[PDB]
Scaffold this active site. Structure first.
Site: not given
Ligand SMILES: Cc1ccc(Cl)cc1O
Length: 162
Positions: A11, A20, A132
């Site tokens: 972050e 962001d 996946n």
């Protein structure tokens, strides 16, 4: 390595309001302020969260305080979620960190799209789960971070975070 160090890498740390990866006003260590395009609304949210008039700037201590609140609330949300808790509780502590990381980034509504990945993770079909997980808007929009989180899910090690 631990969840705090992991999310700090993913972050970053910024002390002034910034946008962001999705264009949303944010501060600190990925503390989302608002999805509103109104910078004034974002500044109001910031003042509310810190408890003073910040005029869009906070200190490192204040950033870390929001970060601790945000990480904690993410975990507590997982534990309250009937779809997430059994999967979370099935995992080892390293993989639980990958789970917290993903929820921190995309929210529980974001992780709702991951039902098939959840099932594979609960089954400990790690390579299948990793395949996946990458078939996602998440992966395509933030591939470098998603690769790190997925490697953490696949291996149960911190190899992706050095
Ligand atoms: C992929 C994934 C599995 C379990 C949990 Cl709790 C969260 C996640 O984002």
């Amino acid at each position: 390595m631990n969840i705090f160090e992991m999310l700090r890498i993913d972050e970053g740390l910024r002390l002034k309001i910034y946008k962001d990866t999705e264009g949303y006003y944010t501060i600190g260590i990925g503390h989302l302020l608002t999805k509103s395009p109104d910078l004034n609304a974002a500044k109001s949210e910031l003042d509310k969260a810190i408890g003073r008039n910040c005029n869009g700037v906070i200190t490192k201590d204040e950033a870390e305080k929001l970060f601790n609140q945000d990480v904690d609330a993410a975990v507590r949300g997982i534990l309250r979620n009937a779809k997430l808790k059994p999967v979370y509780d099935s995992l080892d502590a390293v993989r639980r960190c990958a789970a917290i990381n993903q929820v921190f980034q995309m929210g529980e509504t974001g992780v709702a799209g991951f039902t098939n990945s959840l099932r594979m993770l609960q089954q400990k079909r790690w390579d299948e789960a990793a395949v996946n997980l990458a078939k996602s808007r998440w992966y395509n929009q933030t591939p470098d971070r998603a690769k790190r989180v997925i490697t953490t899910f696949r291996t149960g090690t911190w190899d992706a975070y050095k």
